[PDB]
Design a binder for this molecule. Sequence first.
Ligand code: AIJ
Ligand code: AIJ
Lengths: 245, 245
Amino acid sequence: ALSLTADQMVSALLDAEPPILYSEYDPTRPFSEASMMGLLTNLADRELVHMINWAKRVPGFVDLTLHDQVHLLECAWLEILMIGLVWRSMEHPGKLLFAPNLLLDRNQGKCVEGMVEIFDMLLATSSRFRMMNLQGEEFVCLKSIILLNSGVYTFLSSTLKSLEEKDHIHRVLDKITDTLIHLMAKAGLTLQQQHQRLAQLLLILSHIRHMSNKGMEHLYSMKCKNVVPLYDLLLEMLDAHRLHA
Amino acid sequence: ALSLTADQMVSALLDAEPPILYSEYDPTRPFSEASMMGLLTNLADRELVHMINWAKRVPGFVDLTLHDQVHLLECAWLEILMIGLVWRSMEHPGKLLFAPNLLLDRNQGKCVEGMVEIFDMLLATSSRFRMMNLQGEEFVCLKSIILLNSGVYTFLSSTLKSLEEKDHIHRVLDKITDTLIHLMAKAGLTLQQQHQRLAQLLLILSHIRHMSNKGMEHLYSMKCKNVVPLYDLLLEMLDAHRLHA
Ligand SMILES: C[C@@H](COc1ccc([C@@H]2Oc3ccc(O)cc3S[C@@H]2c2ccc(O)cc2)cc1)N1CCCC1
Ligand SMILES: C[C@@H](COc1ccc([C@@H]2Oc3ccc(O)cc3S[C@@H]2c2ccc(O)cc2)cc1)N1CCCC1
């Protein structure tokens, strides 16, 4: 990502995109019988495996230590799931496309206590994306910034290693800024519109953080999975051998 | 803020800055006897009055409806308190300057259950500001963006009035982006450094949001004041007559 061109970062990120998964329920069977949170939790857990694969293809990420990769993902995984959900919901006003076979409106969120509040925030984000005409190339840049940025301030220590890690991350974020600006210039925005649009995009990331924080608060009202710490499951997933090479 | 120059926004914001308040405790008396949360809560409540005064001097803010002013402040007040705290702590590594007569280190945070975690996040933000060499002129721009941005996505409705309000806010944020870019150009940064520094600044705002959200979670473990809704107290403060004109 540090000698990669702007055109090469954009292609690398497009190449890395995870697949769109389906909800797992029998579509020949009724709906009142379904646990909406079970459906959503099962979907999200399945996406997480693919998020790990994606993160390893973000330029610069695997040059980090395993521990720092785990930390970043532990800090950003729900933001990353949510921006992906808002992105595929963009062309579906008033609805959230959790999966191609699971498209829910706000009243379907009332089904779970405290969940309509989260739905409403997600829906508003999707509407802002649509109104901004967010582009596929801009979205993958944003998703990678979330991955690199959300946990970069909470690394405990400040060892030599740690200082080098933070420098490298800030260097990669810098190149993704250069890429976003490059995309906007290519599109024919003036200098002035570029910086304004860059700021508009980056401020949405503070809303996504808000949504992740609220969603974490909401998810922690027990019912879901909280077995084995998240660190450990992420590490297991991230700490791959190379035998299947 | 919409026909204001970049030089006029910067001066308007510098002019609007609130005063630095002191902690209210008898400095002739011992410390173990002090409620650290009482001291911090009393300080923060006193700052809030001055925050309302400041917000009314941010270009564009008072052109909003009273209700929308209340909403923005309800969404941003803790972020705004925290960025002010990190800013005055910048030149005090390892310590948080809550007031000139109340300078606390992380171990003094352990005094309150769950508070050291918040202190540690604040301290790390202060260190990042220092390392970035954040400037007084950049800080007031950031503080005003927080005020305008944090609640702009959660307005319920979408009345004509509401749509006009959102447009105006996004227009003001745009001019503050123009101002930040103007400040950086004046300082002699290249085009490339400007956009990179703009992005570095705006991404810190996602960390400040995180800290506010965590702090709200922490403050809600009862002991503090939660009497009369915050909306209502903000409204009271904001809904001024003009008789003392
Ligand atoms: C905690 C469990 C389940 O996590 C979940 C479960 C459900 C969802 C909910 O469903 C999805 C499903 C896929 C997707 O890409 C996004 C979301 S968001 C939504 C949600 C989030 C928070 C909230 O308060 C209400 C709804 C999102 C995450 N595992 C997640 C991976 C590690 C543990
Ligand atoms: C809720 C009460 C008190 O709010 C407070 C009380 C204390 C502080 C704590 O003390 C200050 C004091 C001044 C300042 O500018 C910032 C902070 S931050 C800190 C804090 C915040 C969250 C947390 O979990 C732990 C420490 C910040 C806000 N009133 C606030 C205005 C309306 C109600």
